[PDB]
Ligand binder design. Structure first.
Ligand SMILES: CCN1CCN(c2ccccc2CO)CC1
Length: 209
């Protein structure tokens, strides 16, 4: 049972702007997704400060980067607070309508695409490198759900019958054919060191056979 939703008009515009604008500094997508994961981990940590049982679904607070050349995917896993179904539908927990409005007003005022994270819609920079994005997520108060979109104005939401996560969010980027450099270890390492050197959680870059 798959439900299909239309993006709000402003978010569909933001996505086609990211997909069609010529912009060479595509590596900022990883900084934005790691920063989103750090925010989600800060949230479950703060909640656990007054209620330790919120960590019953997993005490470790971390971020994993998993490249897979066979599937042409780069996956960013965090054990943060996760997202409910309502959150997923509501633009993955962001204020994406007013965020897009401020971002686009800033673009015409001298900003560039790399500043997207300052307007709360950094997740969508995933479409700088990915043709399709799958988000698997588990919040303590809800079941495990899968969100998916290849842009084009719509996304789907379904109950995820896959591997149980415990708690957190998994962003799977199905990379464009000419963006496979972001599957190479030394390239990911260079980008993490350049843009995410001070993240307060351990970032583990997995290797392949
Ligand atoms: C402001 C609300 N936050 C909700 C959680 N976030 C998020 C969004 C998209 C994918 C993955 C994650 C977390 O890993 C960051 C934004």
């Amino acid at each position: 049972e798959v439900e299909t939703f239309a993006f709000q008009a402003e978010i569909a515009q933001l996505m086609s702007l990211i997909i069609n604008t010529f912009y060479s500094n595509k590596e900022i997508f990883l900084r934005e997704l790691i920063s989103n994961s750090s925010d989600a981990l800060d949230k479950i940590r703060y909640e656990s400060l007054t209620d330790p049982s919120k960590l019953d679904s997993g005490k470790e607070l971390h971020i994993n980067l998993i490249p897979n050349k066979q599937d042409r995917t780069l996956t960013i896993v965090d054990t943060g607070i996760g997202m409910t179904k309502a959150d997923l539908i509501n633009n993955l927990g962001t204020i994406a309508k007013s965020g897009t409005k401020a971002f686009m007003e800033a673009l015409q005022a001298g900003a560039d695409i790399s500043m997207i994270g300052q307007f709360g819609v950094g997740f969508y920079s995933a479409y700088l490198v990915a043709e399709k994005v799958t988000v698997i997520t588990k919040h303590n108060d809800d079941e495990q759900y899968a969100w998916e979109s290849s842009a084009g104005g719509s996304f789907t939401v379904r109950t995820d019958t896959g591997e149980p996560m415990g708690r957190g969010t998994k962003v799977i980027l199905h990379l464009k054919e000419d963006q496979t450099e972001y599957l190479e270890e030394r390239r990911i390492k260079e980008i993490v060191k350049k843009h995410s050197q001070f993240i307060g959680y351990p970032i583990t870059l997995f290797v392949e056979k």
